[PDB]
Amino acid sequence: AAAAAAAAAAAAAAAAAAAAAAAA
Amino acid sequence: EVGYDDIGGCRKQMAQIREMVELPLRHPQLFKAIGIKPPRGVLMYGPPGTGKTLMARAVANETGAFFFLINGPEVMSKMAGESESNLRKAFEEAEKNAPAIIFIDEIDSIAPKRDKTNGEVERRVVSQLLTLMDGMKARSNVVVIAATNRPNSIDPALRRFGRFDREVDIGIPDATGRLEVLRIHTKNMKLADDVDLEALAAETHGYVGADIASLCSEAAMQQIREKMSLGVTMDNFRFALGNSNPSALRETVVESVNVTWDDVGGLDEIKEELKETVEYPVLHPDQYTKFGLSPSKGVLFYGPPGTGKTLLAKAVATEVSANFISVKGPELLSMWYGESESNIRDIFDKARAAAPTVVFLDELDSIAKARGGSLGDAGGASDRVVNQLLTEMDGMNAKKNVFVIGATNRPDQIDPAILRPGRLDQLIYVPLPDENARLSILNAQLRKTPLEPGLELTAIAKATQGFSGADLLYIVQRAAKYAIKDSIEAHR
Amino acid sequence: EVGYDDIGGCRKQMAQIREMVELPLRHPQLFKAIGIKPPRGVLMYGPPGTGKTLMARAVANETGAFFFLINGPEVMSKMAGESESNLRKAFEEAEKNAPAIIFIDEIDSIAPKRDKTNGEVERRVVSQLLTLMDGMKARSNVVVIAATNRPNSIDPALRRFGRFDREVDIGIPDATGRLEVLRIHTKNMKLADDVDLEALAAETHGYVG
Numbered sequence: 114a115a116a117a118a119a120a121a122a123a124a125a126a127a128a129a130a131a132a133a134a135a136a137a
Numbered sequence: 138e139v140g141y142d143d144i145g146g147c148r149k150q151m152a153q154i155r156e157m158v159e160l161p162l163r164h165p166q167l168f169k170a171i172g173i174k175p176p177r178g179v180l181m182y183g184p185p186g187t188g189k190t191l192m193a194r195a196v197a198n199e200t201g202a203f204f205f206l207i208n209g210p211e212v213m214s215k216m217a218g219e220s221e222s223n224l225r226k227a228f229e230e231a232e233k234n235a236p237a238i239i240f241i242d243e244i245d246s247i248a249p250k251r252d253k254t255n256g257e258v259e260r261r262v263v264s265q266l267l268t269l270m271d272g273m274k275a276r277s278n279v280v281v282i283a284a285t286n287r288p289n290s291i292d293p294a295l296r297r298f299g300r301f302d303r304e305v306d307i308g309i310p311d312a313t314g315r316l317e318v319l320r321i322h323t324k325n326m327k328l329a330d331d332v333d334l335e336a337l338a339a340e341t342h343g344y345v346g347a348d349i350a351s352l353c354s355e356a357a358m359q360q361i362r363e364k365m366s367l368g369v370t371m372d373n374f375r376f377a378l379g380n381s382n383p384s385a386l387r388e389t390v391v392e393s394v395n396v397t398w399d400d401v402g403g404l405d406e407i408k409e410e411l412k413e414t415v416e417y418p419v420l421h422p423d424q425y426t427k428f429g430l431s432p433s434k435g436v437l438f439y440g441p442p443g444t445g446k447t448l449l450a451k452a453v454a455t456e457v458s459a460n461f462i463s464v465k466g467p468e469l470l471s472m473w474y475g476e477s478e479s480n481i482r483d484i485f486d487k488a489r490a491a492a493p494t495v496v497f498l499d500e501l502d503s504i505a506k507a508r509g510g511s512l513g514d515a516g517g518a519s520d521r522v523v524n525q526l527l528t529e530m531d532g533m534n535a536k537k538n539v540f541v542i543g544a545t546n547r548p549d550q551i552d553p554a555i556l557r558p559g560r561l562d563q564l565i566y567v568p569l570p571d572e573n574a575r576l577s578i579l580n581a582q583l584r585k586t587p588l589e590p591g592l593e594l595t596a597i598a599k600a601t602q603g604f605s606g607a608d609l610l611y612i613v614q615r616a617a618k619y620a621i622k623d624s625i626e627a628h629r
Numbered sequence: 630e631v632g633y634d635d636i637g638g639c640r641k642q643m644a645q646i647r648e649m650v651e652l653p654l655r656h657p658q659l660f661k662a663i664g665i666k667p668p669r670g671v672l673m674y675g676p677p678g679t680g681k682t683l684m685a686r687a688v689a690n691e692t693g694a695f696f697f698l699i700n701g702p703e704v705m706s707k708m709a710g711e712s713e714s715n716l717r718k719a720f721e722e723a724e725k726n727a728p729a730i731i732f733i734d735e736i737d738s739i740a741p742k743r744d745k746t747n748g749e750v751e752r753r754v755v756s757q758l759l760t761l762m763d764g765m766k767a768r769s770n771v772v773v774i775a776a777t778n779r780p781n782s783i784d785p786a787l788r789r790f791g792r793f794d795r796e797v798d799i800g801i802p803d804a805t806g807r808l809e810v811l812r813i814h815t816k817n818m819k820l821a822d823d824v825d826l827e828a829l830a831a832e833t834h835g836y837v838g
């Protein structure tokens with residue numbers, strides 16, 4: 114009888130990328 | 138020096154905090170032939186801004202000891218030795234120079250949970266204090282009096298065996314504790330002989346400690362703008378209640394409704410019943426300890442829409458001395474994965490540390506979400522906001538004002554887990570106002586308005602039988618719109 | 630110079646920011662013998678286009694002091710912790726030339742929330758500004774002004790007792806407030822005998838400034 118009308122994506126935290134500060 | 142009068146009248150957390158640091162350091166004889174030694178390192182939680190650094194200065198003056206102060210986040214630098222060798226100097230220099238008391242604060246960002254970082258410079262630094270605190274085996278000589286708020290950010294690796302297994306909580310200075318912090322701030326400034334300190338501490342009730350020095354200093358600026366041997370008059374503190382603004386309530390800046398217990402409510406029996414159960418545990422705690430009954434935390438509103446279930450929520454916002462944090466229904470529910478379970482936790486945690494406080498959770502149909510027959514309505518088990526609120530509810534509620542105001546139109550969609558008698562004990566329903574109560578609805582709107590002389594009034598309430606309380610707002614607006622329409626036609 | 634005549638409208642707010650900067654500088658003995666001086670910081674939040682950068686130009690030219698300007702994220706560099714020192718160098722130059730006026734801009738990235746942020750440079754500039762603010766206790770000082778939006782993106786450790794405790798909102802003028810704005814911006818221009826400034830702000834109702 115009842116059919117689900119949605120999957121409702123609620124997740125996913127993506128990538129990141131760092132910032133390498135040079136040392137000397 | 139700050140002495141002992143820097144925190145006065147708060148001996149419910151000031152005399153018992155001397156049992157942890159001063160009394161072990163006074164003599165080592167009480168720990169002999171008693172077995173284990175509990176107070177190795179204590180952990181202090183509570184509202185931030187009460188004197189967490191003043192009490193670190195108070196222990197150094199009353200007890201003669203070598204005090205080495207650490208400001209906290211100043212050590213953060215990318216130099217191997219500037220953030221590694223200096224923390225070793227804080228443990229070894231105090232050992233030879235006995236006693237070895239040490240203080241650190243603002244450890245919110247320092248040592249986070251292990252999911253945030255892994256093998257970085259910041260994770261390498263905070264692992265050295267795990268073995269340096271365990272390395273000091275001096276008998277009743279070293280103690281950690283570390284003062285840090287926001288307890289959900291501290292990783293639980295520091296409370297394993299004996300490092301921070303002594304939990305102490307700084308209470309709110311409510312029972313004659315807020316009077317002495319105003320006493321020490323007026324002995325150095327100028328004041329006129331027209332104010333009363335008991336009346337100043339009894340009007341406002343929402344204090345965070347750091348705002349206590351802010352409300353008195355705001356009255357000093359009020360005397361400057363009128364006057365352009367000075368003193369602070371009576372009306373300078375009277376200007377301070379319109380902008381209280383504590384440090385914890387810095388996100389609720391919504392407009393407050395003007396209510397004087399006469400512009401709301403057609404019923405007085407059900408209105409007085411919710412007033413009586415919300416004013417007892419906030420004023421004095423001696424009545425609940427004598428009767429022995431547990432105080433009810435939170436009330437549910439249900440019935441027809443437009444009856445006055447959120448209009449009364451604005452009435453509990455200003456007249457009740459407890460603080461008011463409002464939410465706009467399902468707005469406290471984020472998009473991301475863990476951000477949705479955190480936003481319903483950050484609001485309840487930031488309020489309970491300074492809590493003469495009621496909260497207004499609106500639209501419980503969007504919170505309970507009819508969990509019976511879920512079938513994955515939120516996707517990948519994202520409907521876990523119903524039981525996360527059950528963890529915040531009935532958690533550390535021994536003399537803690539947490540009154541959830543639930544205004545709801547359909548009572549059948551709420552799951553009965555919150556309806557259990559261990560969580561909510563008062564169930565009130567606002568019924569249809571009769572002919573004796575509809576006259577109070579129209580008198581609330583015809584109070585502060587210019588009006589005509591008296592026409593028939595009881596015949597209006599006798600003909601509108603069958604409609605709710607918001608429907609009489611429609612008949613009072615059409616009568617008020619027709620008073621402005623003919624006024625422009627009377628002009629020219 | 631812009632002065633105070635260039636800031637039109639918001640007269641309920643202009644008295645708040647003038648008594649915290651000029652009155653400690655004009656009469657420093659007035660704050661004596663009445664306790665500690667209250668105003669140490671202010672956060673100018675709200676909508677972006679309300680006239681919030683010219684308020685820093687107004688306090689940099691009306692009173693006679695030194696104006697050192699700090700932009701948004703500009704202190705970031707590739708060194709062994711220069712961002713915690715170059716921000717510290719901006720406050721030690723203000724301590725040398727006291728009294729002066731400093732201005733920090735775009736507090737949306739320099740001081741974010743600690744739990745939401747990620748990184749090692751962005752989480753240490755939020756820690757460095759916490760220590761040098763309350764530790765600095767000099768009288769007749771450069772006490773900080775900031776002009777940014779999103780007040781909910783500000784950490785609550787920045788608003789506790791003495792860092793930012795007199796925060797104000799630049800309100801949106803809805804009635805008789807945009808009339809003062811148009812009297813200033815068209816004062817430099819030579820208008821003809823055809824416009825009516827009583828009717829310009831009356832027919833429009835939504836603007837930002």
Ligand SMILES: Nc1ncnc2c1ncn2[C@@H]1O[C@H](COP(=O)(O)OP(=O)(O)O)[C@@H](O)[C@H]1O
Nearest residue numbers: 144185186187188189190191242318346347350
């Ligand atoms: N009665 C009081 N109790 C606590 N702090 C008080 C009181 N009266 C004034 N204060 C002030 O409130 C502030 C409390 O900050 P504190 O908790 O020591 O710092 P932090 O929480 O950042 O470590 C101090 O500036 C202190 O002087």
Ligand SMILES: Nc1ncnc2c1ncn2[C@@H]1O[C@H](COP(=O)(O)OP(=O)(O)O)[C@@H](O)[C@H]1O
Nearest residue numbers: 401402443444445446447448449578606607610
């Ligand atoms: N006597 C009254 N008391 C409170 N609100 C009233 C009254 N008469 C009319 N109203 C108005 O009717 C509306 C209904 O208020 P309320 O029942 O609290 O909210 P809701 O309709 O969202 O459940 C509000 O706008 C309120 O101001």
Ligand SMILES: Nc1ncnc2c1ncn2[C@@H]1O[C@H](COP(=O)(O)OP(=O)(O)O)[C@@H](O)[C@H]1O
Nearest residue numbers: 635636637677678679680681682683776810838
């Ligand atoms: N008092 C004021 N009312 C309205 N607009 C103003 C006011 N002062 C300056 N402006 C306008 O603001 C702009 C310059 O500052 P602005 O761009 O708003 O700075 P920011 O975006 O950094 O807040 C110009 O367009 C100027 O005309």
Ligand code: BEF
Nearest residue numbers: 447500544545546
């Ligand atoms: F606004 Be009510 F809670 F329907």
Ligand code: BEF
Nearest residue numbers: 682734735776777
């Ligand atoms: F230039 Be403003 F501070 F956005």
